[PDB]
Amino acid sequence: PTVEEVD
Amino acid sequence: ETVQVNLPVSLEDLFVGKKKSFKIGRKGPHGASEKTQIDIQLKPGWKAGTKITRKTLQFVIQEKSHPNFKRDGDDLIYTLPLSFKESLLGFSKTIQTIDGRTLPLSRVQPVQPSQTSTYPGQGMPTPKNPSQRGNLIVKYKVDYPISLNDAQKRAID
Amino acid sequence: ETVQVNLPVSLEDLFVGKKKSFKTQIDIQLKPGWKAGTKITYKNKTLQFVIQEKSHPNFKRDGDDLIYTLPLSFKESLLGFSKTIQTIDGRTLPLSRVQPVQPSQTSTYPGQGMPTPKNPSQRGNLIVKYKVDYPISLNDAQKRAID
Structure with a gap:
């Protein structure tokens, strides 16, 4: 489980 | 090594094949807390489940609701x-x-x-x-x- | 070798676990709750029965x-x-x-x-x-x- 960060 | 990561995009994004781009977290030199900016090139029509691809990540395009x-x-x-x-x-x-x-x-x-x-x-x-x-x-x-x-x-x- | 055979049944059969039958004479005792594609292997040319559920x-x-x-x-x-x-x-x-x-x-x-x-x-x-x-x-x- 990584950290998803939209953009 | 390659790890799978899901990427929820929108029907509209997939429709236009937008250059969706986001930052994701990882480790780094001698144990860290990073966030690396990645660039994904969607293509008009891409169906969810498709995948585009130190450490290695396997990305699977995902259709937001x-x-x-x-x-x-x-x-x-x-x-x-x-x-x-x-x-x-x-x-x-x-x-x-x-x-x-x-x-x-x-x-x-x-x-x-x-x-x-x-x-x-x-x-x-x-x-x-x-x-x-x-x-x-x-x-x-x-x-x-x-x-x-x-x-x-x-x-x- | 091994040549599998389509075996049509009725949702009814599969339901109550029926004992079906039909050159040789075979006899199959349908277990309760078998779905389409349940394997039935009878050693000897090894015959295998693939289940089909009629409409x-x-x-x-x-x-x-x-x-x-x-x-x-x-x-x-x-x-x-x-x-x-x-x-x-x-x-x-x-x-x-x-x-x-x-x-x-x-x-x-x-x-x-x-x-x-x-x-x-x-x-x-x-x-x-x-x-x-x-x-x-x-x-x-x-x-x-x-x-």
């Missing part, structure tokens, strides 16, 4: 809900197509509980040959009033 | 569940009804309602499905869907009434 369309490969279905009345007498709503255009929907005749209307070339593009799109299907879903009053029942004749 | 008159299977679609008329989809339906095990089940039905609704009837793959003691539900025959055109009279 659209508030109006339910996708079927290259077809797009829109479920226009209908009041009991406008279900037998007619209605004149209006819907917004996947690409911004507004589409006038309208009847003056009863509609069958699942009766549909298909609009050619108005769906999602086809990955192989993208200059071709699937097509939009609009589904009428009639709404029944719960328990009905005396007048109501009497009237039904 | 069914009223039901459409979905896992441990059975799906039946009751056709209603316009009047009965709004004013209620009282129909029947022969369950898979044989008995008859009463389908009655007094309140209008959401054409798109689904009523669930527990233990009326098919025997689970684990312990046959358990059974999937029986799902009932509806096909309400709506008016096609309307007349001066009917119009006002709905209006």
Whole structure:
């Protein structure tokens, strides 16, 4: 489980 | 090594094959807390599940839940809900197509509980040959009033 | 080698674990809750039986569940009804309602499905869907009434 960060 | 990561994009994003780009967290030199900016090139039509690919990450494009369309490969279905009345007498709503255009929907005749209307070339593009799109299907879903009053029942004749 | 054979059955058979039969004479004891494609290997040319479930008159299977679609008329989809339906095990089940039905609704009837793959003691539900025959055109009279 990584950290998803939209953009 | 390669680890799978899900990437929820939007039907609209996939539609235009936008250069969606985001930052993701990882480790770094001698144990750390990073966030590396990645660039994903979507392509008009890309179906979810597709994947584009120190450490190594496996990305799987994922279709966010659209508030109006339910996708079927290259077809797009829109479920226009209908009041009991406008279900037998007619209605004149209006819907917004996947690409911004507004589409006038309208009847003056009863509609069958699942009766549909298909609009050619108005769906999602086809990955192989993208200059071709699937097509939009609009589904009428009639709404029944719960328990009905005396007048109501009497009237039904 | 090994040449598998298509073996058509009836949702009924698979239901009550029936012992079927049909140059040689074979005999298969259908376990309770076998679905399409359950392997039956009989050593010797090794014959293997692939299960096929013939279409069914009223039901459409979905896992441990059975799906039946009751056709209603316009009047009965709004004013209620009282129909029947022969369950898979044989008995008859009463389908009655007094309140209008959401054409798109689904009523669930527990233990009326098919025997689970684990312990046959358990059974999937029986799902009932509806096909309400709506008016096609309307007349001066009917119009006002709905209006």
